[PDB]
Amino acid sequence: LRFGEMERDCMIAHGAASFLKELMEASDAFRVHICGICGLMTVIAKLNHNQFECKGCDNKIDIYQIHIPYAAKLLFQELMAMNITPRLYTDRSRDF
Amino acid sequence: STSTFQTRRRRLKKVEEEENAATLQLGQEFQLKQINHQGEEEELIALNLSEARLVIKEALVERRRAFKRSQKKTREKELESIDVLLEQTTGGNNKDLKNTMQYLTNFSRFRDQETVGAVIQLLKSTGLHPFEVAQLGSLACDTADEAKTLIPSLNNKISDDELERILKELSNLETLY
Amino acid sequence: IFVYQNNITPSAMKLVPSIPPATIETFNEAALVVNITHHELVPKHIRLSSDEKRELLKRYRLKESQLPRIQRADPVALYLGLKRGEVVKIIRKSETSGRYASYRICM
Amino acid sequence: MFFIKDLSLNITLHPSFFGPRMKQYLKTKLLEEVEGSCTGKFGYILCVLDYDNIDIQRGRILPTDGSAEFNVKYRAVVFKPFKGEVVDGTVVSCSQHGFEVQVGPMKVFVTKHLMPQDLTFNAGSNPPSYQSSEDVITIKSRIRVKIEGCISQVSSIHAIGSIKEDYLGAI
Amino acid sequence: KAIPKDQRATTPYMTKYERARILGTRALQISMNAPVFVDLEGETDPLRIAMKELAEKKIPLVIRRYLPDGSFEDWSVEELIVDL
Secondary structure, rough: OOOOHHHHHHHHHHOOOHHOOOOOOEEEEEOOEOOOOOOOOOOOOOOOOOOOOOOOOOOOOOEEEEEEHHHHHHHHHHHOOOOOOOOOEEEEEEEE | OOOOOOOOOOOOOOOOOOOOEEEOOOOOOOOOOOEOOOOEEOOOOOOOOOHHHHHHHHHHHHHHOOOOOOOOOOHHHHHHHHHHHHHHHHHHHHHHHHHHHHHHOOOOOOOOOOOOOOOEEHHHOOOOOHHHHHOOOOOOOOHHHHHHHHHOOOOOOOOOHHHHHHHHHHHHHHHOO | OEEEEEOOOOOOOOOOHHOOOOOOOOHHHHHOOOHHHOOOOOEEEEOOOHHHHHHHHHHEEOOOHOEEOOOOOOHHHHHOOOOOOOOEEEEEEEEOOEEEEEEEEEE | EEEOOEEEEEEEEEEEOOOOOOOHHHHHHHHOOOOOOEOOOEEEEEOOOOOOOOOOOOOOOOOOOOEEEEEEEEEEEOOOOOOEEEEEEEEEEEEEEEEEOOOOOOEEEEHHOOOOOOOOOOOOOOOOOEEEOOEHHHHHHHHEEEEEEEEEOOEEEEEEOOOOOOEEEOO | OOOOOOOOOOEEEEHHHHHHHHHHHHHHHHHOOOOOOOOOOOOHHHHHHHHHHHHOOOOOEEEEEEEEEEEEEEOOOOOOOOOO
């Protein structure tokens, strides 16, 4: 089925970042992990022994889970490969 | 890792990483013009031993305190008095800190946050760079040579005479034992 | 602050941004006959110290760009003379809760 | 030489601990994955200062699981030696190839041949040592070394230093 | 980034979306032969057992609350108050 412009425009509205990248429940939808430090997909989630890590920004404690449209994940990964960093943060610090 | 106050826009070609030496050229992460969290500029932070001993102590202590605000619901003498402060507010696997407190407390040269205070109020009139205004504070020195040699970054930034008065007033303030 | 009558010469105006820091502004008589800030609608604004600002962000964990903006030419922005970056606190009345605090950064 | 650098870290918190005293847990985990760490770019993270006013900011919730991520902005006392730095410490080990002095949390080693000449090495000593005309260096003896070169490794930092210059030797 | 269990700032109460999802999620597991931490007063419908585990606050889960900037806060079904 289709998840086009309009259905995207709503997910952006909803502010449902991850689901977009993954509009969602009926198309993409994907569950990725992040570092609460460096907002990337780096994280090495072993959903079993709960181990989580993220060497580099080195973590194990501060880690999130977000739902985003796979396409979006890919949007990001593709960006990173072009050396650009898309940071995913779960809290607003800039106010307003 | 533990990120560091400035995002140096790395454009693919990461090559130039200079030498580390007493030419006062320290890793990019230690220029004298670094950035504070508030978003301001601030001189580097040069700690001379026995000044560090106090700052580490200071927190390790005010830690024990706020570590109980929530539980309601003479040389050798300091070796014991600290091991405790640790076995209380330390990771207990910070064998590094243990070893840093010994060293930091054995080779220290001041016991009064008042004595160390003058040390600072003194050298900080030089215009000298922080790494010097540190090596000077934690290194014994009788002659300008023992100094201007074990701290070559000085060589021309100060007359032998002056650097010598300061050295005089150092061993004068140098708390006893 | 300079007050022109019918207008200024386009040869003239291009001489204000030539002596920094110092700043200058230009106002036509006809636009200052009535204080726009006295109008039933326009609520009162307030300049925020480069301190009060660096705080507004830290308390809402906001990035500068995620903040509601006001025009560099916006009438009230001129009445107070904002500068690209200066934030304003807009305090108005509300039928949902007497007073509502809002902010407008500049662009 | 010891420093007080302004750092920051990222901790991913499982929803589980989204308790009443979360702030508490964070800080605590800050201190587990920091105090005693080691990098070539920061040196030795020895102690987190001002435990109290640690800035947590608002953390964002990731997007597949509920784990949230906060950028913990702190400040601590670091220490990373350099080539050409003069520091003195306590000797620890001493063998045919030299002795290793311990400057703080780190361990600087001195090559037999990086020392002077008139100083030989006595193996038949107990404890092991290095003898001279008038100087005697062994286990507990205090020395002052000049760090000639540094080498970062895993969770530590070693380095070679000399005592062949002037105003260098025991104290 | 994470946030200490102190300095916590969210709502002490469980959001409908949360509770809604907890029960669901929990059902799902219970329905999958996961272990049940309450005595079944004879119940046999997962979402119904889930409603039970949730009233004796015996559900081993944690709701991670991401914030707009990425940081999160972690609360336990235990803590969170359930008005609704």
